[PDB]
A paper describes a structure:
Queuosine (Q) is a hypermodified RNA base that replaces guanine in the wobble positions of 5′-GUN-3′ tRNA molecules. The final step in Q biosynthesis is the reduction of the epoxide precursor, epoxyqueuosine, to yield the Q cyclopentene ring. The epoxyqueuosine reductase responsible, QueG, shares distant homology with the cobalamin-dependent reductive dehalogenase (RdhA), however the role played by cobalamin in QueG catalysis has remained elusive. We report the solution and structural characterization of Streptococcus thermophilus QueG, revealing the enzyme harbors a redox chain consisting of two [4Fe-4S] clusters and a cob(II)alamin in the base-off form, similar to RdhAs.
We subsequently repeated protein preparation, crystallization, and crystal harvesting under anaerobic conditions, leading to significantly improved x-ray diffraction. The anaerobic QueG crystal structure contains 5 monomers in the asymmetric unit (AU). No obvious differences can be observed between the individual molecules, with an r.m.s.d. between monomers ranging from 0.1–0.2 Å. Electron density for the three redox cofactors is well defined, with the corrin plane located at the bottom of a deep surface pocket, providing direct access to the cobalt ion from the solvent. The cobalamin is bound in a pentacoordinate, base-off form by a nitroreductase-type module, similar to what is observed for the reductive dehalogenases and the distantly related vitamin B12 processing enzyme CblC. The closest Fe-Fe distance between both [4Fe-4S] sulfur clusters is 9.5 Å in QueG, compared with 9.3 Å for the S. multivorans RdhA. In QueG, high levels of disorder can be observed for a loop region connecting two of the cysteine ligands (Cys-184 and Cys-187) to the first [4Fe-4S] cluster, suggesting the possibility of ligand heterogeneity for this particular cofactor. One side of the active site cavity is markedly more hydrophilic compared with the opposite face, and consists of the strictly conserved D100-Y101-H102 QueG motif in addition to the conserved D130. A putative salt bridge network is observed between D100-H102 and Asp-130, the latter residue pointing directly toward the cobalt fifth ligand region. Tyrosine 101 is located adjacent to D130 and similarly points directly to the cobalt water ligand, although neither is close enough to establish direct hydrogen bonds (both at ∼4.0 Å distance from the cobalt water ligand).
Numbering used by the authors: 1 to 370
Write the structure that this text describes.
């Protein structure tokens, strides 16, 4: 007894910015739309595939009785700007500044569980953060962490949407928290700011057209999204920056600004090894360097950076990574606005190895009236 007050006490003790409680009752109100996302092809592929495991918490535990939702806030503005150099910089979502949230939160949930082991008997748990089967977002709503916006995210009054979420499924009998009075209203800002219009209106999405996805999808980024990621080479925050509830927050926790706003051409020099050493700790490193270097080439093209030309030419001639080659060929068509005869001969004189490079090459050629 007074576990709920005791938990809350040790929560804030170990850096958890908010905590909530809810039943292990299933979530079949979601079924309908989860299944419709998959059938309509609006799913990314990152989602847990088994829909049953997604809505029935007992499939993850059995002895499930309550679920404890945690939230850890993160800064969205940079404490200290990075220092101007020769090299232009891209941006990379604050969701991925500093240590990979997955590790941070799993550590916090471990501590919370160890601190509960002491104050009861027969305690049973199952921790999740992002990579688990539950809908992290809907759990935090039932637990009154915040409400789900039209942008799909969980929004708190206190810390905005700039929170990482987690869950500790458990066999404890505990008083559910309330939920929240505040919502969206007739706000619509996010819906109108999304540069792809992926958001459907009801907190639901064609994720396939989210730029956050596009920056993480493997392969060749479709033409439409290249221009639109501007210089943001990982994630998208547009639907949160445009949100009233984020209007005036700064939040607590360590950030290297050079990892948060990386210099692009030096970034393109990284190997698997140097990439691991320097970037391996952030969330955005979970698929390796290649998707990021592709994106960086795109950023350089979006900046029309004449200083990248020689590097792009090196990527193309070496051709050890075809996605990069094809992206670079495109990038030259963007950067070199008035090509000299020498450049027309360079371009005319490539004969792309593979189909994606061939495709991008044909387009530049056509654009340059070759
Ligand atoms: C797959 C995934 C993605 C994909 C797909 C995004 C998406 N919206 O589905 C991509 C790569 C695009 C993505 C992007 C981002 N994501 Co992500 N993503 C996930 C992941 C692993 C699973 C997503 C999932 O379960 N799909 C849910 C889809 C299928 O459901 P749906 O049909 O849209 O359902 C919506 C409705 O049911 C609605 N719903 C619930 N309550 C209510 C109430 C009412 C009345 C109504 C009508 C509807 C409604 O909410 C659901 C979505 O939130 C989750 C973690 C997790 N396991 O939950 C993180 C998660 C959702 N992502 C997270 C983050 C931070 C992001 C980004 C902000 C990262 C960035 N800065 O770029 C973006 C923003 C995109 C966005 N607008 O949601 C955080 C959200 C943070 C928060 N505080 O809410 C989560 C919770 C991870 C975490 N542990 O923090 N993500
Ligand atoms: S992250 Fe960007 S692209 Fe994705 S929904 Fe939000 S605004 Fe739209
Ligand atoms: S922008 Fe407005 S509509 Fe969108 S989530 Fe924020 S509050 Fe809701």
């Amino acid at each position: 007894m007074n576990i709920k007050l005791e938990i809350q006490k040790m929560a804030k003790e170990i850096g958890i910015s908010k905590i909530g409680f809810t039943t292990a009752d299933d979530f079949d109100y979601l079924e309908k739309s989860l299944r419709l996302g998959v059938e309509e092809g609006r799913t990314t592929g990152f989602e847990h595939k088994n829909i049953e495991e997604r809505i029935y918490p007992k499939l993850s535990l059995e002895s499930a009785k309550t679920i404890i939702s945690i939230a850890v806030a993160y800064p969205h503005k940079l404490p200290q700007q990075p220092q101007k150099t020769e090299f232009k910089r891209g941006k990379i979502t604050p969701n991925s500044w500093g240590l990979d949230y997955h590790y941070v939160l799993q550590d916090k949930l471990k501590r919370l569980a160890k601190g509960i082991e002491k104050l009861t008997e027969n305690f049973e748990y199952k921790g999740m953060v992002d990579t688990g089967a539950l809908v992290d977002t809907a759990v935090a709503k039932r637990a009154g962490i915040g409400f789900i916006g039209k942008n799909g995210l969980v929004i708190s009054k206190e810390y905005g949407s700039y929170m990482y979420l987690g869950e500790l499924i458990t066999n404890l009998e505990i008083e559910p928290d309330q939920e929240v009075d505040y919502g969206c209203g007739d706000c619509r800002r996010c819906l109108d700011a999304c540069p792809t219009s992926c958001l459907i209106g009801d907190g639901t999405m064609n994720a396939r057209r989210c730029l956050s996805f596009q920056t993480q999808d493997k392969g060749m980024m479709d033409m439409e999204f290249r221009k639109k990621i501007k210089t943001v080479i990982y994630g998208c925050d547009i639907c949160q920056i445009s949100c009233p509830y984020n209007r005036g927050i700064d939040n607590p926790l360590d950030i290297d600004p050079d990892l948060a706003m990386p210099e692009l051409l030096p970034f393109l020099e990284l190997t698997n090894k140097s990439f691991k050493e320097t970037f391996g700790m952030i969330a955005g490193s979970w698929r390796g360097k290649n998707i990021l270097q592709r994106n960086a080439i795109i950023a350089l093209a979006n900046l029309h950076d004449r200083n990248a030309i020689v590097k792009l030419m090196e990527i193309i001639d070496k051709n050890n990574n075809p996605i990069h080659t094809a992206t670079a060929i495109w990038a030259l068509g963007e950067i070199v606005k008035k090509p000299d005869e020498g450049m027309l001969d360079y371009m005319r004189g490539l004969s792309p190895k593979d189909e994606h490079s061939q495709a991008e090459w044909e387009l530049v050629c056509a654009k340059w009236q070759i």
